[model samples]
Target: ANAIEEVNLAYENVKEVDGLDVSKEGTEAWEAAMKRYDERIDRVETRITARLRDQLGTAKNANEMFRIFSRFNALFVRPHIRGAIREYQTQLIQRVKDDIESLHDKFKVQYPQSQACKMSHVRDLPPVSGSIIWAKQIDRQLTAYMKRVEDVLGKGWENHVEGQKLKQDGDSFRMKLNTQEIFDDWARKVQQRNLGVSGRIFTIESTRVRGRTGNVLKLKVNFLPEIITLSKEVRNLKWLGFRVPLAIVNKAHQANQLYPFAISLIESVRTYERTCEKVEERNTISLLVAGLKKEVQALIAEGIALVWESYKLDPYVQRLAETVFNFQEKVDDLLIIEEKIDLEVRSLETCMYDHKTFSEILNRVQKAVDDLNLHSYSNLPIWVNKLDMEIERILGVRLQAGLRAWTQVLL
Candidate 1:
């Protein structure tokens, strides 16, 4: 209860910053400031609207509203600062890669007919001679890189037999999982069933059909492609505004050129991916991954709860402990088990023993057995019983753990 109350208060307090002219709409000073910075903030904050738009939009409650605002602000603000820095770092690395590629091309130009020419090329360009040589060098480096990747990261993906999988396959990976069978029938079944459901009679089939890899078949569902091939057509334009390069730099140019196309290229491939997802909400694979995420979360929570609650308790922990051990225990037993034991004196001992590390979940009757061994305090049986349930719960686990435990625990 205190945790909930405290969180509510903290959420309330955090909102104070949320209202702080986030978009700086009204104030002349704010407008003047944006103008000084040449609308840089507003420009990047494309999602930010005309009216006050916190993702927490007009928060009615603490958690929901705050969470939305926090996420929205994070999506907008934090990315502008942190994400930009990372983007710059990645850009720097890419520049280095480009330079490395340039070197390989140079090596090919110097030794066109030699074996070194293999290490230097990009692709075929309609050039008289030098372009071909440079392109070949880049191709050599790239081909070698692919082989290196196979040697390094691809070892596990390479299929090897069982014990061999453990030994040599450790060095040579073969992803020997059976090829997935397509369940087009299942897809058709689901599709048909859904269609039927919209009308009336729908039946779930008893047997399943497997495809080539002995796995269930999946029917791929795709959306209509965007009609605007214009974007693609525009992008395909190679000769952009007639900027021509006569030849490779001949040492007279010691540096590569950089154009600050940053402002224009507001997004990368990831942005395009998000746009794709929005446009086409049809990735069954993504849905599968989402379910996996939830399941993994539950498993991790169980582990953390098992670890944390077994050790100790905080103030919130104490309250939680009481709820589970005290009140909940009595309800479960008095209504459900309806058994009584005589451990009146040793109630606390039995309680501790019940909830002990990897110990058997001490049932209500078990607590009474231990209570009989301890000092005779009135209501000792009930109190000890309550203590039994409360012991671990008060000792908090991580959020997912807490949530999962709650699912199993809720009185």
Candidate 2:
């Protein structure tokens, strides 16, 4: 009875070895702890088996011997081994559950619906294959663990209830993972295809449809007509007013808004230049480009009109003198109008200089007229020439008056 009690106590002690911490299954601490447990259980098994064998040898009658045999069958028989195997199976299932739960949590956090359509470019997105590879690693590890279980639990153990439950859990995880993997694979192909298309006309983004298990790649086509409408709005900015300073400031802001569209337009043009296949699309884009150019030309004409309104020789000369004093406060680099209007403004500045001799002023006026003639606008040349002839006639009148005065002095 004492020996049987001792065997029972030893078996209970074997069962008391710490349960596997599924979360730390692959860590060095877990490995060392499991080793310690195996060693302790082995020592206890040997001790109990020896004590039982000794009791068997000393049994005095058939009934006593049968009683000892019964204890041996219960303690050291298939039940003990099977119980140990069941514990290992439970731990493995728990480990897989922990891994899958964490994996799903990570997927939810990293690939949330809010961020799905937020990426402006495919290049800005996280690698599509990342989650697939993560799931594959977990699947592979689970497969290896199951193989280990099968080796210990026998060939047909998977047909048993516990094994079937583990198999079902693994299959369910695999199916979910595979669904996501298929979507990721499709996303990768979409990204590759979009790279071949011009981004100026359209962009592809991943979106999560409600009631759908996987993401849907959506194509957003840029409306080219909207750009033309915006250009018209830019052209409509007030350019002639007492509030011209604010007007020009507003125009500058409005003009900057078109720059991005201009860049996209240029990209579209270059893309078509390379392809040369889309005839109707090319014609539409060409018309848009011409219309944009016309609007910019109209803006330059407005600037020129503003210059003509403000042009006065005396005030201009004073402003030129102040230019030296205010050299640090430079004009901003104009985006669209610099090349068109800057040279004409500089010519006006040169014409404003107060020359000491009539010949010097005449030479400067002729130079200004020549510069205006070289400009693209036909009206500017005629206007500058008219101003030049008027100045010449006024100087001629002044010379004739001086001559009459000199003649009277001689008399």
Candidate 3:
């Protein structure tokens, strides 16, 4: 009934969705679906309440609390978590790869000479005569190997990002589900119980007059098995000869059911959240990003080694090689700076949500970005200019063709 009204309200607000009007037949089916969902939620709430009741009786420390919480998260909340991760998975791989790859590619092209200088061995070499063709050939070999690594790196990075995206999405959703509220409510009550603040422990006695046996007294310990209630007086007692106690069993008034009931109510939100989460099968994604990083670094090293070996013979080429060596070192340093900048930005998300210190985090972010206000003043600009100088020297008269190639790489 409530579901029907909600659907009606939604339909009234939005005249038509996907070309379907809020007609009687459509609404009737919608109502039935809502009813089924409600019934399912009711059953889940009951199950969770029973579980919480049993667990609360023995819950002691944080470890126990975490165990209970994580269990429900996996059982009731994890599905939605799975779904969000899967939902983001396709984008995760492509987005991260594009960013990282673009950064490296532009850095290399911008400071080709400095990047070349990173070949430490070549920078250390004497002005020896070497074949320019042989140099270019070795460099070609190096690029081929680096290309293979890039292929592997992209694949590996995708796997890693998928895992990371899923876990991040699920955790974010789980935390938002008022898990803390449910836990806090239950924890407070359980803490009181553990400290002996509540629950039954008392005695009761009755004084009454029996026919022909006046002023008969009766005692019953634990008269109220729930609350700490005590004595009352009875004016008349009918029993005389051998009045025996009889047992009666039935559902009595429950004061302790409140916490469990409250938790169940809260659990439904998380449960519903989980239901909406989609999931997919993914093999080992956790370490792929790190693996890709290693592969990329290795490729960079190989490229530098090839460049270092190049132009050892030609005087003009040797001069270009020296510039390349310097360029390589400069590019490496600039990359480190860029990486630090990336990390700084990423930490803002932690401040915004995880630690609630966005004010401080955002200030730092602004400070880093603000330094760029002055012309030719910042570290990034200095590094970039230095790279441009080396690239000009490396290509010398061929700078035009080199620039053309850089542009055409994308085209």
Candidate 4:
């Protein structure tokens, strides 16, 4: 219902289509047939709700949530688009049956003595109801089916503007999250560590970038995971979770941090905004806008045929179709914008942390940290007493990239 209404509303004079099946069985007549079917389905839905009693008879549990959701969506959602098609088919079949019954009247006109044509005789008859629907002609009422959806929502060829706005809001939130959790970690490692500049670069040549090929440089990391695991293990045994719980301070949470992740969370955002604005705008957005201009110009080629045809329709429908096409075109153009911007932002964001290129950093952080075996000093204080785990197993690099990072010891 919401999908129909959404489509209807977007469409208007054109108005709103709250909901329709977003899924497709992939037939042109599917939408029209389903719109007609929805009339009966509306009452059947309420009837099912009235019949089902949960506590008295039905099995219900937390695990059933997914199953129930699947059933409801299949029933309510799946049919909206295709169910209408079924109704059209049902009506078409019935109309044909009714035509045979009416043949007696027609037979009287042609042959006074002739009994009504036999069912077998007329079984293969040409459709007499052609006048009812103009079989050879376009089904004009199907226009309203199309119109109803368009009225409810702009013809759904484009991202619903309302949905786009919500997603754009999410993109902004995710943008901020990516900046802090992923991007700035690399940025700080570069800036404060002074690990990548002049002396460390050696040649810093523009030679064909490894994966990038042509006019780019790549970053690689040579430091071993065992080194980081050893360093963090040392810190874990020192404070011994005195300020934080032992579980929170172990190799898991990095308990020896100078400030809290909460502080890191807020500070990283500030740091990333400044860096990304320059880095992001200069590299990705600039290139993206250039790419987008060319891409958007190319898309105009796709709809030239439709635009020409719509130009010939009666002024009103032509205007309506034109509006639908224009809105659709605009939405497509916006997606190009999102794609271009996202691609650039992702590229620049990724480049912000090529840590391996900073030879100086490898020496400063990796070199100073001792090999310090996990169990060599295991007898220090009361703790896990086991350190024979794989160096990478203890390190668990990707794990900290998520919410669990703060739960461990600091390096």
Candidate 5:
């Protein structure tokens, strides 16, 4: 949010000046001010009334009402200033158009014919002309067209100069309707219809449907003529109140300006898409690591209970005691690995990793769980009598390099 004082300056410039006196409200001064700037006063009142009604809510007493009015004083001033700007802009555009046409006539007389016209004495002494000359009249039309296009596209657009000032002051976007925006559809069509001025005998197609039912076809319409005719067919397709010029048509047809814009937008969208995937992957790995950690801790707790169950037979319990203490020490080593895995899981919550990288991590965790299942189950007293001394034979691979080195070392 911008400072209210800064934002208010543009809208609050209806200050007391020499000519207009807003100091006296009840007398002719107020009436005179209203009459002098009626249109502007109405616009400001409309905007301010709506904002106060909807945003400010209620004002209980006369004193509260005055405070509310003071707070929104800038709103009333903005419209009067904006109206003056609009009036000045209207005069400027008219002055520019008139000056251009007046200057055109002076330049028309002195302009050259063509590169071909200066060659011979036969062409130098002519008082009257027959066919249209590309050197003089057509050339002037091209020049006028160029100037017109420049005026409407450049000077008439939003955020050109005046709009930039309004924007800097934190005023709401004062969008100016330009020729390109007004006749956007027409301009787009002309650009798509790239009639090359290169070929001498350029062929064009025209379609006239006498009725609606059947497909009616057959005629060659010049691209320029087709565009010109299209302006009348549609309501708002006027290209600066003139025929579709060859220059504008050629310019519009050159490239897909929108295509490049869409490509740039894809990067913005993909950032969100990429972030969403990274968040999901990290959470998934966190849950999997947590499950492995809890299962290992539960196994350690069960090992203590298992040792107590064998205490009834003193010789059996004493013999198994050496192996059991060593096994518990080795299990403690396994707990260290689980601790490292947890640190990696915590790091995953912050950093991002690709699918291949996370998949490899998940695979290692799964391997650890599988080996814990086989080692913890196979060595139990329940499976001891059934296994008979077939450790090297039944286990298939004796040289297995597994998730834990406890596979080769432990009971």
Candidate 6:
């Protein structure tokens, strides 16, 4: 009876030590408690083993031997303690593996392989700052698991082959998390470049100006530098093989063609203006004046052709074609009338005027005035009114003088 009570007391002591809580797993206090637990278990094992051996030697009957063996079996300590510790380690390792697997699944879903090179398809990427926080959180969780495992399994656990494999997995996962940042930066850079290219292209394509001569002049005057700068910029980007859209490159190329062509038309208009000024000094229609008038017509024709070509390249400026054509015709008619007035002025200076010549000049002036009135309904009333005043100034006085001479002859 005493032996049984003693065995029970020793087994109870082993259980109590095993059940005690050590909150700080790797601290000195925990180590001291664990040492006492180990000693109590060892003592129980030693006492039970010696008692079983002695009983086996002294046993005379099968029933007594069976009782002795059963009691010894009940007091056994090593197998139970070792099994419990192994189960605890298994649970810890399983938890770590589960976390790693969960994190890998998340990575695969968020950052897929198919969109790796497609910077434009960047909506799949997690938000920049948020993803960084998420990565840090996952790292902290993984690191905590690794630390917990190390604490439970001791320093020698890292030297084990399986432990090293787990550590390598964790390190690789951390490396992959860094790629999220890399891909985010790459997408952001590409987006910025895209905006830069598209912004200039949009400015060129969407520019709208009133289709009056002065307004068109203002448009081109302000617009030429922009086109030239954009052309150079596009050319540089093309030469460098930058990753702009194909349609953008096509538009830039068209603008490059437009710049030189537009310059040619502007220079032609300048020459035409100078030639018109020279014609005003002549008293009669000389061969040189006729040649100047022909040159002015040719310049006007060239302008029409250039405008048409510009329209073909950039179809957005459809009204520019009509406005330019009408303005050029008006200028040509004014030049012809100016030359006729010079001849009529010389005729009047001699105190002789042909009625037929006088009536024809009056008719032409009236027709020009009617044409200006016809375009009054256009949106550019200010410009049309300005041109109306110019016509009245140039032709109105000459026709009034011719009418007075006819009235005097009739009287």
> Highest lDDT, which number?
6
* Cα TM-score of candidate 3: 0.14
Cα-based lDDT at residue 158, candidate 1 = 33
What would the per-residue lDDT of candidate 1 be over residues 1-411, giving only the tens digit for each residue? 534554455445544534565575444545554443334434434434422244324544423432443344435343443343233323322333344445444443444464443533333222212233344445454444334323321353133222222234222211221111112332243345433222111111122356667686321111111111112112212422111111212110211111111111112222323433432353322322333234333432332343223133233233333333332233333323223332322333333322353233345556554543352223444555564555434333333455686788885
Model 3 Cα lDDT, one tens digit per residue, 191-256:
444223232221111233455657553322222222211000000012111111111001112223
Q: Candidate 5 — what's its lDDT?
A: 0.38
Question: Candidate 4 — what's its lDDT?
Answer: 0.32
Model 1 RMSD in Å is: 34.8
* Model 2 C-alpha lDDT per residue in residues 1-411, reported as the tens digit of each score: 655666555555544433344455444445655566556655677776566455536554423433444455546444554454454445444544565556555444543342433441243323333333344555676665556545545554577645676667667656655534444444355345522321232221112244455753321223333343233223323211121234334443554543464444334333432333332333322332333234333432332233222234234333333432222111111112323333443343344323455455456545644553443322444545655565566655666666787789889
Task: List TM-score per model, in order.
Answer: 0.13, 0.27, 0.14, 0.17, 0.16, 0.27
Q: 1 or 4, which is superior by lDDT? A: 1
TM-score, model 1 to reference: 0.13
**Candidate 2 TM-score versus the reference:** 0.27
Please give the CA lDDT of all the candidate structures. 0.33, 0.43, 0.36, 0.32, 0.38, 0.50
Task: List, in order, the clash count of every candidate structure.
Answer: 44, 0, 15, 59, 3, 0
lDDT of 5 by residue, 166-265 (tens): 2232221111112334245545554565334212112212334556568653322223343222323232223124455556543333323222322332
Q: What lDDT score is found at residue 229 in candidate 2? A: 28
For model 6, how does the per-residue alpha-carbon lDDT over 19-137 read when each residue is reduced to its tens digit? 45655544544565456656665566566556545554655542344345345544433454334334444444555666686777776555333233243134323233334435556
Q: Residue 394 in model 1: shift from native, Å? A: 21
Better of 3 and 4 by TM-score: 4
Which ranges in model 3 have alpha carbons more than 4 Å from their true place? 1-315, 353-411
Task: Give RMSD (Å) of candidate 3 vs. truth.
Answer: 42.4
